[PDB]
Amino acid sequence: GHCIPTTSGPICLRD
Description:
This protein is mainly β. It has strands at 3-4, 11-12. It has no helices and two strands.
């Protein structure tokens, strides 16, 4: 996917 914000913060997804 991509890098989006989350409950914990900005996470970089590898899908």
